[PDB]
């Protein structure tokens, strides 16, 4: 085994990204059972120097296989290529030389967007402008990722993170999901930018149900039949009909008649200008 046998693991130095280990202070886990895997940390100088910011850090669990090493390197490498955008979880640096493998990313203090919304459900805080703002920002992030030839494949609210100032940041771009899959991905395993638009529709619905679970009481086995037979989710009560309209256009059976992310950005931007 690579990890079993090596005293030192000779990953190549990439100076664009290598980050000095003495500038990084590991903190508490950044999940439930995520000790030894994903943690909070403080990182100094990124630079506006001698100054600290909070970041997130992934590492290999003490029982990691060669496969886990590969997955983490792959993910690190994908994040190198994509570039920087305000509405994605950006790579900040890597520690690969002279010690354990660390992948360092932006930390969004408020967690994922499903739980952000669910926690703040009324019996306002989650007003229509707030919801539209979440929708708009996710759309901009996707427009960016699509421009970098990146198909997400698992765009869902659990995979959007919320910063201290309520900025949306898409995560898991560098890697039950069935309910978020376009028919052509379910049936034919084809993923396109337009299958991510479908996924976005579902995410919109998540937003407007304040973190609701899609297709309530429908077993994932029948979802395939139902969607082929033209089943679609209904309008959330927190949703004006004009928005439900967008949602439904995202779930058009024909990929070419779904809007693009550019159009979703522009439509949503107008709804903000209206308020
Ligand atoms: C420990 C098991 C496990 O890996 N669970 C999945 C998982 C999903 C997300 C995060 N995580 N939560 C975050 C948060 O609330 N705020 N900001 C960030 N960045 C958060 C993450 C997260 O941390 C890292 C570190 C490194 C990479 C490459 C990616 C991510 C993400 C998405 C933790 C665990």
Reduce the secondary structure of the chain to three states and give it as a string.
CHHHHCCCCCCCCCCCCECCHHHEEEEEECCCCCCCCEEEEEEECCCCCCCEEEEEEECCCCCCCHHHHHHHHHHHHHHHHHCCCCCECCEEEEECCCCCCEEEEECCCCCEHHHHHHHCCCCCCCCHHHHHHHHHHHHHHHHHHHHCCCCCCCCCHHHEEECCCCCEEECCCCCCHHHHCCHHHHCCCCCCHHHHHHHHHHHHHHHHCCCCCCCCCCCHHHHHHHHHCCCCCCCCCCCCHHHHHHHHHHCCCCHHHCCCHHHHHHHHHHHHHHC
Phi-psi region at 20: left, alpha or beta (left = phi > 0; alpha = psi -120 to 50): beta
Range 108-273 has CATH code 1.10.510.10: yes
CA atoms within 13 A on the CB side of 266: 5
**Distance between CA atoms of residues 239 and 131, nearest Å:** 10
Both tokens of 233, joined, read 């989710």
For residue 115 and ligand 1, the question of a CB distance below 6 A is answered with no
Atom from ligand 1 closest to the CA of residue 35? 1
For residue 135 and ligand 1, the question of a CB distance below 6 A is answered with no
Listed in order, the ranges of the chain carrying CATH 1.10.510.10 are 108-273
Resolution of the determined structure in angstroms stands at 2.3
The pairing of strands 160-162 and 102-106 is unpaired
Ligand 1 mean position, distance from CA 30 (Å): 7
Residue 203's closest CA among 121, 272, 261?
261
Q: What angle do CA 41, 43, 45 make, to 5 degrees?
A: 170
Residue 159's closest CA among 112, 105, 192?
112
Task: Give the CATH fold of the 1-107 domain.
Answer: Phosphorylase Kinase; domain 1 (3.30.200)
Both tokens of 121, joined, read 């459900």
**Distance between CA atoms of residues 192 and 148, nearest Å:** 13
**Distance between CA atoms of residues 201 and 156, nearest Å:** 10
Residue 175's closest CA among 159, 157, 198?
159
Neighbours of 275 (CB within 10 A): 9
By the 8 A CB rule, do 244 and 235 touch?
A: yes
Q: Which of 56, 90, 164 to mutate to test the pocket of ligand 1 (most atoms within 8 A of CB)?
A: 56
Give 26's contacts (C-beta < 8 A, 6+ positions apart).
39, 41, 57
For residue 36 and ligand 1, the question of a CB distance below 6 A is answered with no
In angstroms, what CA-CA distances link 177 with 21, 145, 227, 250, 259?
Answer: 36, 20, 15, 17, 22
Residues written for the chain: 275
What residues are labeled active site?
Answer: 154
For residue 38 and ligand 1, the question of a CB distance below 6 A is answered with yes
Name the experimental technique. Answer: X-ray
Distance separating the N- and C-terminal Cα atoms of the chain: 59
**Distance between CA atoms of residues 61 and 162, nearest Å:** 26
């Amino acid at each position: 085994g690579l990890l079993a046998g090596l005293v030192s693991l000779d990953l190549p130095l990439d100076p664009l990204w290598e980050f000095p280990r003495d500038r990084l202070v590991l903190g508490k886990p950044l999940g439930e059972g995520c000790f030894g895997q994903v943690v909070r940390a403080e990182a100094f100088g990124m630079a506006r120097p001698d100054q600290a910011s909070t970041v997130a850090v992934k590492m290999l669990k003490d029982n990691a296989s060669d496969k886990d090493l590969a997955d983490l390197v792959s993910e690190m490498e994908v994040m190198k290529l994509i570039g920087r955008h305000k509405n994605i979880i950006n790579l900040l640096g890597v520690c690969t030389q002279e010690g354990p493998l660390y992948v360092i990313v932006e930390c969004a203090a408020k967690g994922n967007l499903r739980e952000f919304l669910r926690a703040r459900r009324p019996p306002g805080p989650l007003s229509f402008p707030v919801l539209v703002s979440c929708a708009y920002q996710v759309a901009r992030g996707m427009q960016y990722l699509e421009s970098r030839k990146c198909i997400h494949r698992d765009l869902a609210a659990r995979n959007v993170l919320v910063t201290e100032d309520n900025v949306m940041k898409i995560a898991d771009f560098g890697l039950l999901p069935v309910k978020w899959m376009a028919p052509e991905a379910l049936f034919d395993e084809v993923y396109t930018h337009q299958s991510d638009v479908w996924s976005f529709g579902i995410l919109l619905w998540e937003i407007f149900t304040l973190g609701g679970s899609p297709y309530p009481g429908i077993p994932v086995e029948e979802l395939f039949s139902l969607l082929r037979e033209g089943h679609r989710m209904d309008r959330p009560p927190h949703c004006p009909p004009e928005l439900y309209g967008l949602m439904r256009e995202c779930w058009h059976a024909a990929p070419s008649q779904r809007p693009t992310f550019k159009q979703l950005v522009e439509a949503l931007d107008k709804v903000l200008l209206a308020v």
